[PDB]
Amino acid sequence: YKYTVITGASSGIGYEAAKAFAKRGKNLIIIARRREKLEELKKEILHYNRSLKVIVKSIDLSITSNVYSLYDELKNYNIETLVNNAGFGDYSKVNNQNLEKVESMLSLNIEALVILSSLFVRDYEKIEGTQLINISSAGGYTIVPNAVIYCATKFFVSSFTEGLARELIEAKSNLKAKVLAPAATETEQEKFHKYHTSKQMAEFLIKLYDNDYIVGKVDRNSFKFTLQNPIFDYA
Amino acid sequence: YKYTVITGASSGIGYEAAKAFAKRGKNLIIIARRREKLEELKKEILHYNRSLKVIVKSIDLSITSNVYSLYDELKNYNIETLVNNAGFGDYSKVNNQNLEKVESMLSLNIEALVILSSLFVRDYEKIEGTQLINISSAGGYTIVPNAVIYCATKFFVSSFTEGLARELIEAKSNLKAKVLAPAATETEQEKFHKYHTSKQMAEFLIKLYDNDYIVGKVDRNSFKFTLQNPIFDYA
Ligand SMILES: NC(=O)c1ccc[n+]([C@@H]2O[C@H](COP(=O)([O-])OP(=O)(O)OC[C@H]3O[C@@H](n4cnc5c(N)ncnc54)[C@H](OP(=O)(O)O)[C@@H]3O)[C@@H](O)[C@H]2O)c1
Numbered sequence: 001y002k003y004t005v006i007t008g009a010s011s012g013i014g015y016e017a018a019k020a021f022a023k024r025g026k027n028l029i030i031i032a033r034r035r036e037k038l039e040e041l042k043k044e045i046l047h048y049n050r051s052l053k054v055i056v057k058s059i060d061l062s063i064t065s066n067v068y069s070l071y072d073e074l075k076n077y078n079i080e081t082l083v084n085n086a087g088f089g090d091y092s093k094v095n096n097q098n099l100e101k102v103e104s105m106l107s108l109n110i111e112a113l114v115i116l117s118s119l120f121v122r123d124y125e126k127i128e129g130t131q132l133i134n135i136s137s138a139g140g141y142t143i144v145p146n147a148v149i150y151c152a153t154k155f156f157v158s159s160f161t162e163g164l165a166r167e168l169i170e171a172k173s174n175l176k177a178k179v180l181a182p183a184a185t186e187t188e189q190e191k192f193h194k195y196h197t198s199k200q201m202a203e204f205l206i207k208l209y210d211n212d213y214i215v216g217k218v219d220r221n222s223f224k225f226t227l228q229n230p231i232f233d234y235a
Numbered sequence: 236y237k238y239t240v241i242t243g244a245s246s247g248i249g250y251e252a253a254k255a256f257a258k259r260g261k262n263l264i265i266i267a268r269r270r271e272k273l274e275e276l277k278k279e280i281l282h283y284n285r286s287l288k289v290i291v292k293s294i295d296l297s298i299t300s301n302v303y304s305l306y307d308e309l310k311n312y313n314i315e316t317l318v319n320n321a322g323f324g325d326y327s328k329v330n331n332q333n334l335e336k337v338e339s340m341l342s343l344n345i346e347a348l349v350i351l352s353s354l355f356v357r358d359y360e361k362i363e364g365t366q367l368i369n370i371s372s373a374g375g376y377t378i379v380p381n382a383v384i385y386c387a388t389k390f391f392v393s394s395f396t397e398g399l400a401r402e403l404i405e406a407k408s409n410l411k412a413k414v415l416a417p418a419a420t421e422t423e424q425e426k427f428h429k430y431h432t433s434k435q436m437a438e439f440l441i442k443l444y445d446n447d448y449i450v451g452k453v454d455r456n457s458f459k460f461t462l463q464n465p466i467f468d469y470a
């Protein structure tokens with residue numbers, strides 16, 4: 001059996017992504033801190049399709065050692081798709097920002113994502129049908145006032161993922177890497193401002209998965225979702 | 236007594252930057268792991284100008300708690316300029332990259348720089364004459380094959396620093412933030428390929444310090460150094 005691994009599966013995009021992959025008949029490994037929420041999701045998925053396998057892994061990915069330990073626990077499973085979706089944003093002027101929150105953004109949005117991505121590439125680069133999908137942000141391509149550090153973490157995610165995707169293509173690897181860049185969603189007034197629901201964003205994630213473009217990005221102004229080629233300059 | 240604080244001062248750009256600021260009459264706080272190298276630099280500086288105050292701080296900035304401990308010690312001094320120059324690079328394909336090296340790159344190139352930058356902004360944003368200079372890379376604006384993770388760390392540094400610089404301007408803060416983006420230097424056959432020496436880069440750093448532009452960048456193709464406005468898209 002093959003598995004789709006989703007971090008940040010207890011709420012938001014990751015929760016709806018788990019449901020979307022389940023509707024496609026995928027076995028799932030769902031990871032987040034809130035164990036009860038993950039168990040709730042598992043029950044919903046199995047009530048929908050009793051034949052699926054769903055593995056719950058409650059773990060804090062902001063601790064480096066937990067990232068490596070999670071990956072080693074996953075070695076007993078054939079991973080078809082890894083979605084690095086867990087992440088955190090904190091909006092503030094830099095001068096009075098809570099630096100412990102900053103540390104969290106760095107550990108989760110950058111470190112956990114790059115380590116899990118790199119371990120997955122190491123082991124699965126040559127395996128047919130594999131996909132790595134990293135969740136960035138439209139703010140990983142445009143700096144947004146009051147989100148300077150958060151945006152910088154997403155510039156990391158976008159540039160890392162584009163670079164890796166192009167490296168894999170140049171190497172003729174079987175594994176593909178792709179980046180999803182949501183704009184405003186319900187997890188961030190609603191009467192006057194455009195946003196996507198988490199369910200809509202999971203649908204866009206499936207579209208990215210199903211197509212052969214590296215970038216799936218929501219324009220921050222028009223809210224149109226577009227599949228497109230890498231955005232950043234490349235040597 | 237005011238001080239210019241330079242991380243990564245034991246060799247390379249930071250070493251030459253220390254000498255350049257000493258020639259401008261600045262007292263210095265010089266930081267790196269190799270205490271003996273910092274002590275040698277101090278002796279070279281005082282041979283030139285015996286009246287300068289030069290404080291040696293040997294510390295490993297890849298350890299989070301050390302970054303905060305260092306900043307606490309720096310509270311004993313009036314900091315005029317902070318230069319976040321300590322950094323390193325590792326060139327590899329992702330699939331076989333040393334992840335210990337990756338962790339160190341993340342900790343030093345991103346975490347130490349963002350923490351020290353943010354603490355400095357908190358305390359000095361309203362203090363006339365202060366400057367924060369972060370050392371990125373031309374690879375923080377162009378992704379370079381075989382340097383995917385390194386480039387992503389520098390995309391972080393560039394986007395963080397541009398965002399912060401614009402935030403300070405919008406807030407009418409006295410503190411200025413700027414980013415230096417070197418291309419190839421001697422720290423990275425030779426007779427066919429252009430590069431800047433560390434001394435030349437330190438001269439470009441002084442030019443950035445002296446002028447009214449946020450970005451000082453070496454074009455990867457022409458090796459021309461240009462002072463310019465922020466490069467990344469901004470909302
Ligand atoms: N405009 C934007 O930039 C934008 C908008 C929407 C989404 N996004 C991105 O999309 C991703 C999903 O976000 P979302 O909107 O769905 O928000 P969300 O509802 O807050 O989901 C975040 C997920 O990550 C989990 N997680 C958080 N911290 C964790 C930790 N230390 N260890 C393990 N898991 C952790 C959270 O669950 P637990 O608390 O149970 O651990 C949750 O399942 C994120 O990368 C976010 O940055 C970006």
Ligand SMILES: NC(=O)c1ccc[n+]([C@@H]2O[C@H](COP(=O)([O-])OP(=O)(O)OC[C@H]3O[C@@H](n4cnc5c(N)ncnc54)[C@H](OP(=O)(O)O)[C@@H]3O)[C@@H](O)[C@H]2O)c1
Nearest residue numbers: 243244245246247248267268269295296321322372418422
């Ligand atoms: N084209 C490019 O991308 C490019 C080219 C050149 C330079 N740069 C950037 O310029 C900066 C300076 O680099 P450089 O060329 O001058 O290289 P370098 O000669 O290797 O200098 C690096 C400095 O950082 C120090 N340092 C390294 N690790 C440290 C740690 N854990 N804790 C504290 N200090 C540490 C090193 O001294 P110790 O070993 O004594 O700690 C040294 O003083 C870096 O940010 C680098 O990324 C970029």
